[PDB]
Amino acid sequence: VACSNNSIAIPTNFTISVTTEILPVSMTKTSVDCTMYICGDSTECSNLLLQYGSFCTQLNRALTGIAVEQDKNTQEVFAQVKQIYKTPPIKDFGGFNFSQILPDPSKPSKRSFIEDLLFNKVTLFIKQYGDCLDLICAQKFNGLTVLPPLLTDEMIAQYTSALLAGTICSGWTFGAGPALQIPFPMQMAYRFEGIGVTQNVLYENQKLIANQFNSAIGKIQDSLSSTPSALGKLQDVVNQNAQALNFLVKQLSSNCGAISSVLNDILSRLDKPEAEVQIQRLITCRLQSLQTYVTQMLIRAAEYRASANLAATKMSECVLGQSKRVDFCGKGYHLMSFPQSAPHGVVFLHVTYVPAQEKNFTTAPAICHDGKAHFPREGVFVSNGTHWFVTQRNFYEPQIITTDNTFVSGNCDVVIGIVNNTVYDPLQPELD
């Protein structure tokens, strides 16, 4: 790294970067009916399952609780707007093209282009249950059932659309109060100053910025199509849950010391006093297998709550406002964030400002005018050869050092690195 005693580097150009962050929000809601799972509707087992007390009750309630939380997680992340907003047929945003994030009415569920890519990338035992369709299926899947969400894909898509329409047409104001319309270019102006970059930069370079933005968005399609760009975070949710269910199914073929894995064969060709023992032994193992499954699900559920809580936080701080937290809403300086829906989760597109080309300048902590030390009101002092200028830290825009750009504090005998120069007084030429 460069290191200096008397010099400074300042960016002369910048780029706009759009990055993708993918967070899990929820998982497929499932339930296992302990009694039929273990006994298979056999009478002898059912009676021998009551002597064990309320284990099935606790396990059923543990799983029910998880299923309920999955809907809470979803609404906490997505349902942050009470109103449903729509964009006008007029797309006049100053050169900013949002056609890939806005809903397309010709598409299924009226998803946007990018959302359609996400849905067709994540690959979703569960399908077999969906195909047989609820008791009739439960009788075939050993008490393992799948429950529908309260919010369907369309409902979630509507929330996402409303959030986007709000963000684009009214900035962040709708997240605190009433939605206040404002031209997109002006929202950007106020987001630029919000990261220490004077608003004039946007207006003067608006065309370039719009072009960099539009290209940055197009590149998203290639990133998603080329590799599992954090898509594995959602694919793993599917895979981990699927194999957990496969475990339960496989265990129903185990003996665990029992004469067989089939209750009908235990009862057949065996006197009652022993069949009771073989059944109890099989019940014990199946119950333990079920406990193992539930314990794992309780822990995973906790992980998803934490993820959902983070996703909800991101919605509030990245999308409905402008974060000052470093690397919270992506690398670089945060400007905007645009959410997209996804299978079992939420995807955030983070728009950030990043410095590019830079130059070396000679610097100084203060300027000595006439026995008094002048400090910069905003920015730093730099020398471009034989002349000194004051400029904002994040963009090399040199300006003349004047009495309106500095303040006087203390004398020239106090500051160690103070440099002799002339501060321009803008009023004297008017008197003379």
Added chain:
Amino acid sequence: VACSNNSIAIPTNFTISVTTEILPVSMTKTSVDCTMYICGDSTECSNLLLQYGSFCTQLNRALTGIAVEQDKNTQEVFAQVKQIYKTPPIKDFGGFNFSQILPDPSKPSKRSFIEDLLFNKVTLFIKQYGDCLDLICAQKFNGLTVLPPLLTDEMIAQYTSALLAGTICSGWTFGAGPALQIPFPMQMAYRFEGIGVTQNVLYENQKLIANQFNSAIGKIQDSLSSTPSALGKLQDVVNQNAQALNFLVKQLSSNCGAISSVLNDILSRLDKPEAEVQIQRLITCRLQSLQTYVTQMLIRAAEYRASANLAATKMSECVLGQSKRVDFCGKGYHLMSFPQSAPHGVVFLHVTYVPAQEKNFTTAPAICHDGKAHFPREGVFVSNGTHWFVTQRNFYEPQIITTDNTFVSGNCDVVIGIVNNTVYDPLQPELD
């Protein structure tokens, strides 16, 4: 939602809103003495429980660890001030009435009015243990005991009182260093500018603001008295723990394949070599039931740690400072937060600023004076018909556009939406 290409909406009025957020901090500390729980002080079981190794040791330590954490959670949230502060007998806060949050010496535990409402709203097996009062009770409750907190309700109330006295008389300064006294109206002035609202608004509308505040507080009583306003978050802590204990008790009546659920009846009327088997079978089930209980408690404890950590964060960022994080300290723009104690948790009253009435104005990104582009130093440009003004974004207070309200950057041929107008120079009239 409204959407525009050339116009803007600006709030002309505002209201003050007070919302309530309720977080769990801790749960009743309990402990189960594995050996007596399982064996009931029987000799035969005790001896047959040693052959199983250190299961009871691990379970006892798991529960002990949870109980310890409950006190850590409490002190981390509440004990953030080393000193105990008291308010003066003189309540001169500029019209702001805090009588409902400040401690009332005539009340039990010297709680405030609102706190008394919270304590009389949350409804608290455990009571039966409290009534029998420690070994004597343990012998009757099957090894299930309840431990006292290190910090009693009075001690917690004192911490809350100290935090409130600090917040009211010294703002946030005491949270970083020494407590620096400052008039309440001045603290508010500095909290208003902190959300982008010029301090003159407070002083000019101080009476209205104090009235809106006082009414907002009164409405809290109705919200708590009318419905379980997030009070269910605390009632659920009680209910979930109570039923977990009920499960353990119920399981002590189960056979789990054993000849009976009573150790005395297993030993009676049965030869030793078989009684050993029946006892071992019963021990196995009771131990498994205990493991199930402990596992659930470990997971719930984790949830409470996370909640307590959040509550501690809120204390630091909402109460002892001014959050910039969106929707972190309630909806709207954060001004102040006043904590209140509660059964097994903490309640935060969040005071936020919310925009109200609004009007439509015509806008522009810049003004063109004489071949140079003028940008607003702070706020936006708006037209009220035939005249242009500059005003702060969050409150419609129109001012004349002058050379002291703008800065010059670039020329008039660069900015797309630039509007021709006159910028007033305040010095020329003095020369002439």
Added chain:
Amino acid sequence: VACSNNSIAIPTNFTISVTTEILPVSMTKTSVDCTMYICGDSTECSNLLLQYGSFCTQLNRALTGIAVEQDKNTQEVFAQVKQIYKTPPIKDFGGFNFSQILPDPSKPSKRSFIEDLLFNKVTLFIKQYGDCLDLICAQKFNGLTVLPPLLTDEMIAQYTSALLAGTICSGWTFGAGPALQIPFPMQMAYRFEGIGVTQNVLYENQKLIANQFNSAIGKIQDSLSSTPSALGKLQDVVNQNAQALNFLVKQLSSNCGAISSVLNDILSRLDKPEAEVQIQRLITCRLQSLQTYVTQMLIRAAEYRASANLAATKMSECVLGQSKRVDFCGKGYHLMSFPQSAPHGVVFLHVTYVPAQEKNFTTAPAICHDGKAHFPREGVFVSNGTHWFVTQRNFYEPQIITTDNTFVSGNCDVVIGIVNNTVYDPLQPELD
């Protein structure tokens, strides 16, 4: 606490404080090979372990998953910089001495002095495995093995060094974009204004500040050497994991109702049909003991993920930037943070600004000049006896009230506490 109606306290001096925060990041990666752990390579057990299905498969995968996460946790916290940076041989930082945090080439692993203290303070069954060295050891430790980290101490130290070199020579810029060199004294200047303290304070008191800093660092050695200054947070990780392993080992000596705890003795002197029963009974208990162990490890792993996530957040917000969050990066106002490596965790040295000596002044919300109310542009109005001044809140530096220090809003009949005084107009003396 002091409380006032018409007065204010303002700090006249300050100190620099350095505090230490210690967070766990990861734990020793271990694995238990279920099959050999339970059966001890006996044939009879191995065959009788297959009838139980996929319990060993699930347990092995549960532990494997934990081990993998431990490396993820480490890289997320430390590997936030792609480049490896080095400091120059010239230590010209304006009087700031970093010799205790920078790497010393004469030391083992090229650690810094403070890091060496941390490594020699935390005390690390596991050592016995390390001493026997992988199957050969597994055969002696009952299937309990220890895995190496992907990032060795040297690699982690290099990341820490790179982060420090960056922080010192280029501030926070390298965390957002390219590394931009800047004199250390200037970085501090921009961190002081970042907490509401005018930059002139640093330059005028640079020597004092450097001295306070250097002493604050030296005191760290005494804090670590004198007491377990949060070092218990790392020692507990070692202790908790060690005893968990000791539990597994102890359980291999239990009978759990079996004829003995030794498979060779169960098989010897016992007919096969019964040996099968005694083995199955022993397998059941050993498997349950293993399940208990794994469950505990899954929960602890979750705690470490949460801790690692916080540590990663601190790296981004405290070290690679400047936090505005209260008490997030230590008590007082945050300036800088310097990370140090440690056994199984990360240590943050937080540099904060704290107000010291203070004085009482009489205050006012506004000044009335000639029928119009003047409000302070920045800071507060105070009286030092018979004269009024305007000064910044966090440091008593009184200045004359002028037209350039205030703004006019409304008239003198609106503000309640307004005080009659004279505002100085700096231009009139030039005309006259």
